[PDB]
Amino acid sequence: FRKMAFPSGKVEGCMVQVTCGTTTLNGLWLDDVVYCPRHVICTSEDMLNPNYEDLLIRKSNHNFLVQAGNVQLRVIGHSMQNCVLKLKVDTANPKTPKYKFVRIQPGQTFSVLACYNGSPSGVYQCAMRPNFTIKGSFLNGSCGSVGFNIDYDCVSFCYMHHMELPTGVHAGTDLEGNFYGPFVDRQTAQAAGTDTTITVNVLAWLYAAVINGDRWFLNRFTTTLNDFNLVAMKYNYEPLTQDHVDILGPLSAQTGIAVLDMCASLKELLQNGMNGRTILGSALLEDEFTPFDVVRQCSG
Amino acid sequence: RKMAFPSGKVEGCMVQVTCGTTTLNGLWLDDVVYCPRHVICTSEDMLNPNYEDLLIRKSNHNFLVQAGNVQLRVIGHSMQNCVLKLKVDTANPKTPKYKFVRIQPGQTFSVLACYNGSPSGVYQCAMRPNFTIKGSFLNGSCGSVGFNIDYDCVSFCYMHHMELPTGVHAGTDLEGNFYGPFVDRQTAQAAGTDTTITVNVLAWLYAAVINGDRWFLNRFTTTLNDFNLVAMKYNYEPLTQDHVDILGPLSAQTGIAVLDMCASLKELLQNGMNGRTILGSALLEDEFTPFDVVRQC
Numbered sequence: 001f002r003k004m005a006f007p008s009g010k011v012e013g014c015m016v017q018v019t020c021g022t023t024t025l026n027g028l029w030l031d032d033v034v035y036c037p038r039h040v041i042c043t044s045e046d047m048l049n050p051n052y053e054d055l056l057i058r059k060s061n062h063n064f065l066v067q068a069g070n071v072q073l074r075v076i077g078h079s080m081q082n083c084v085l086k087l088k089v090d091t092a093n094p095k096t097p098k099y100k101f102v103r104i105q106p107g108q109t110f111s112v113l114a115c116y117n118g119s120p121s122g123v124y125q126c127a128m129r130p131n132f133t134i135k136g137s138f139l140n141g142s143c144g145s146v147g148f149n150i151d152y153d154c155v156s157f158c159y160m161h162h163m164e165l166p167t168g169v170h171a172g173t174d175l176e177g178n179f180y181g182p183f184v185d186r187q188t189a190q191a192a193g194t195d196t197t198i199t200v201n202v203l204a205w206l207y208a209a210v211i212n213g214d215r216w217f218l219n220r221f222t223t224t225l226n227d228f229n230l231v232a233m234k235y236n237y238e239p240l241t242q243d244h245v246d247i248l249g250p251l252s253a254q255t256g257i258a259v260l261d262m263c264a265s266l267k268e269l270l271q272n273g274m275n276g277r278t279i280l281g282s283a284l285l286e287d288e289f290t291p292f293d294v295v296r297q298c299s300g
Numbered sequence: 301r302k303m304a305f306p307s308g309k310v311e312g313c314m315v316q317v318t319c320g321t322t323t324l325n326g327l328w329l330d331d332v333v334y335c336p337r338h339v340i341c342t343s344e345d346m347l348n349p350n351y352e353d354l355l356i357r358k359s360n361h362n363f364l365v366q367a368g369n370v371q372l373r374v375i376g377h378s379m380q381n382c383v384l385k386l387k388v389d390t391a392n393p394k395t396p397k398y399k400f401v402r403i404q405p406g407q408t409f410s411v412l413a414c415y416n417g418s419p420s421g422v423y424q425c426a427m428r429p430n431f432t433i434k435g436s437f438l439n440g441s442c443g444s445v446g447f448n449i450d451y452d453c454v455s456f457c458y459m460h461h462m463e464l465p466t467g468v469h470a471g472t473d474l475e476g477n478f479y480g481p482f483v484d485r486q487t488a489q490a491a492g493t494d495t496t497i498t499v500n501v502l503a504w505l506y507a508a509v510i511n512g513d514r515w516f517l518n519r520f521t522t523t524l525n526d527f528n529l530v531a532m533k534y535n536y537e538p539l540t541q542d543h544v545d546i547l548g549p550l551s552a553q554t555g556i557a558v559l560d561m562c563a564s565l566k567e568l569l570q571n572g573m574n575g576r577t578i579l580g581s582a583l584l585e586d587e588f589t590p591f592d593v594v595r596q597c
């Protein structure tokens with residue numbers, strides 16, 4: 001299995017740069033609106049303790065430099081929605097794809113198009129951790145880079161990048177500007193909660209192992225969902241939700257292994273360890289492949 | 301993090317190519333479509349295909365090329381080694397600036413995996429020392445290409461042709477010459493003994509340091525030759541002075557002499573990771589080049 005990103009072209013066609021003063025970051029140009037992090041209006045000194053509403057009242061449309069490459073897009077309106085700026089421009093992006101704004105759940109994966117000065121640098125797959133951080137590769141000027149999934153023809157944007165935490169991980173918002181997790185866009189010390197293992201993805205990985213004929217860990221027991229959740233939490237694994245049980249439905253049907261039987265198999269791996277064996281060539285259980293990612297790669 | 305080049309410039313070049321009951325992908329640059337020649341085979345032909353003889357018996361109209369909902373008319377066809385070149389009457393407006401390159405083992409590239417001429421995913425691969433690649437390719441992925449982007453220029457280096465019994469993959473450059481001792485015939489083929497790309501393991505240990513992780517370092521040092529003796533023992537490629545040079549900037553940046561990192565890698569090989577992990581992995585990663593790590597740092 002590989003970490004496999006979505007093709008990025010449909011998103012590349014939407015990246016622009018947004019500058020205020022000498023503060024430059026990236027924006028997302030969809031139809032006649034550009035979306036970007038609101039701290040573009042901050043001087044580096046204002047980031048320490050910004051009053052965004054006051055900062056914004058001092059701004060006019062003509063204080064915003066929006067460029068696709070080096071071609072300026074005239075700003076004709078601006079508003080602030082949570083932690084994102086919406087800049088109305090006078091040109092509809094002819095490369096706008098079919099798109100959606102979605103708020104993802106911890107455990108879900110997405111591709112990130114890392115951009116600098118409105119130019120794509122690279123694409124990679126990230127998982128949203130249960131503590132609402134992502135382990136990204138973001139440098140200065142990467143803010144406004146977005147994360148997304150592609151379903152059929154439709155780009156679902158789920159992430160816009162805003163900041164790095166002391167520990168090196170990254171935090172950001174959905175495309176309505178609501179942070180994932182207990183973070184704020186202020187240049188202050190913030191800590192993410194202790195992280196946990198993404199149980200639904202580990203289960204997906206076990207199903208993947210079975211599909212490929214590696215199935216020594218299947219046992220003859222089952223569990224209730226509640227009993228499993230209480231045990232898993234003792235090993236710093238996330239509890240399963242009803243939605244998690246549902247999204248494993250296709251892999252369960254493909255293999256004929258009921259979700260709760262697989263949970264019972266995982267519980268035994270947690271309680272007794274691997275006893276020296278490997279699964280898919282690894283002694284570690286992988287938690288950054290969703291049930292969709294497994295399907296994607298095993299038949300796409 | 302394992303980071304691929306943005307794939308947009310390549311997506312605008314992928315088409316579907318069909319001959320008979322066989323469909324795979326082609327690469328449309330200017331007025332030419334490049335694709336694997338085994339698209340002209342049938343099940344029978346699979347096993348010992350005499351390609352020049354199968355090709356002379358095809359007409360331009362035996363090739364159905366589709367770019368989206370639009371059929372492109374084939375006005376001419378020739379074969380260069382294991383790739384078919386289909387001339388079409390329409391030029392691709394989305395053709396990027398591009399070059400064809402043949403890469404060295406240990407170099408990396410991005411793959412755009414396609415099916416029916418439509419992009420499915422993008423990921424980073426390295427040309428293994430035994431000239432396989434550890435890809436994610438299914439039925440219908442042939443004609444998918446690998447590439448690097450420098451400036452606005454796409455350097456195509458790989459076109460996909462086959463899977464081996466071990467699950468790894470083989471293919472050609474865009475001149476149609478295989479990497480490695482493989483042949484486009486439907487048979488089970490083994491590769492040479494794979495070895496680990498040592499300069500890339502070292503680049504990736506420097507990456508772990510640059511990200512605050514240094515549990516594997518040590519006070520020891522080694523000579524180049526003494527390190528290479530140990531490397532070879534564990535089926536690692538030897539490290540050349542040019543590799544050492546190439547590693548300079550990462551050495552300077554971290555203040556860790558190349559040969560000190562070699563001494564760290566030696567310790568890891570002889571003792572193992574003893575449970576610990578590096579940049580998230582229980583195994584030494586060898587598919588980041590020094591340039592890869594640098595660009596991302």
Ligand SMILES: *[C@@H](O)[C@H](C[C@@H]1CCNC1=O)NC(=O)[C@H](CC(C)C)NC(=O)OC[C@@H]1C[C@H]2C=CC[C@H](C2)C1
Nearest residue numbers: 039047138139140143162163164165166185186187
């Ligand atoms: C995009 O503008 C930029 C991207 C950062 C820079 C390097 N890596 C990233 O992900 N975002 C910022 O600079 C943030 C702006 C504020 C208004 C949210 N600030 C930020 O991420 O600070 C990084 C800190 C600096 C310092 C203080 C506390 C924790 C660490 C040390 C990291």
Ligand SMILES: *[C@@H](O)[C@H](C[C@@H]1CCNC1=O)NC(=O)[C@H](CC(C)C)NC(=O)OC[C@@H]1C[C@H]2C=CC[C@H](C2)C1
Nearest residue numbers: 338437438439440442461462463464465484485486
């Ligand atoms: C593209 O047409 C296709 C891509 C393959 C299929 C599955 N994964 C891939 O990467 N290429 C082919 O099918 C090859 C065509 C020949 C003419 C070169 N053949 C091929 O890849 O065969 C796979 C071998 C043989 C077969 C039988 C035993 C072991 C495996 C299945 C490996």
Ligand SMILES: [Cl-]
Nearest residue numbers: 359360361362
């Ligand atoms: Cl003809």
